[PDB]
């Protein structure tokens, strides 16, 4: 299955198609977007984004955000799979400090 993921970047909004078994960061980069990252292993906050609408992405592979933050919609985009059409704001790391 695939989903329409709207990424709202500081530069502009981009609607891309992401399959249910690929990570959002991976697919965004394939489409020419430049999103932040460092570890790419779910263990830091560099790739953080925030869910604006749509179902929550599958974060079973993330570990850095606290249960509280997954709670509130923060997403580690490097290890997040989409689970429905959704809109995510990227570059949100500063927001977690
Ligand atoms: S780049 Fe470290 S958690 Fe995604």
Residue numbers in the entry: 1 to 97
Paper text:
Ferredoxins (Fds) are small iron-sulfur proteins with low redox potentials that are involved in diverse electron-transfer systems. The plant-type [2Fe-2S] Fds function not only in photosynthesis, where they transfer electron from photosystem I to Fd-NADP+ reductase (FNR), but also in electron transfer to such Fd-dependent enzymes as sulfite reductase, nitrite reductase, and Fd-thioredoxin reductase (FTR). The crystal structure of plant-type [2Fe-2S] Fd was first determined for the Fd from Spirulina platensis, a blue-green alga, revealing to have now known β-grasp motif or UB fold consisting of a four-stranded β-sheet with an α-helix packed across its face, in which a [2Fe-2S] cluster is located close to the molecular surface in the loop between the α-helix and the third β-strand.
Notable revision of the main-chain conformation occurred in the segment 67–71, where it adopts a short α-helix, commonly observed in other plant-type [2Fe-2S] Fds. The Cα positions of the several residues including this segment in the present model deviate by 3–4 Å from those in the previous model. Omitting two residues at the C-terminus, r.m.s. deviations are 0.32–0.50 Å. In contrast, in addition to the C-terminal residues, large deviations of the Cα atoms are seen in segments 9–12, 31–34, and 59–72. Here, the orientations of α2 are different; the helix in the C molecule is tilted by about 11° from the helix in the B molecule. That is, the conformational variability of segment 67–72 is caused by the diversity of α2 orientation, but not the deformation of α2. In accordance with this observation, the temperature factors of the corresponding atoms of the A and C molecules are large compared with the B and D molecules. These results can be interpreted as indicating that the intrinsically flexible α2 segment is fixed in some molecules by crystal-packing force. In conclusion, the present analysis has revealed that in the plant-type Fds, the active center and its immediate environment are rigid and highly conserved, whereas the segments that encircle the active center are flexible.
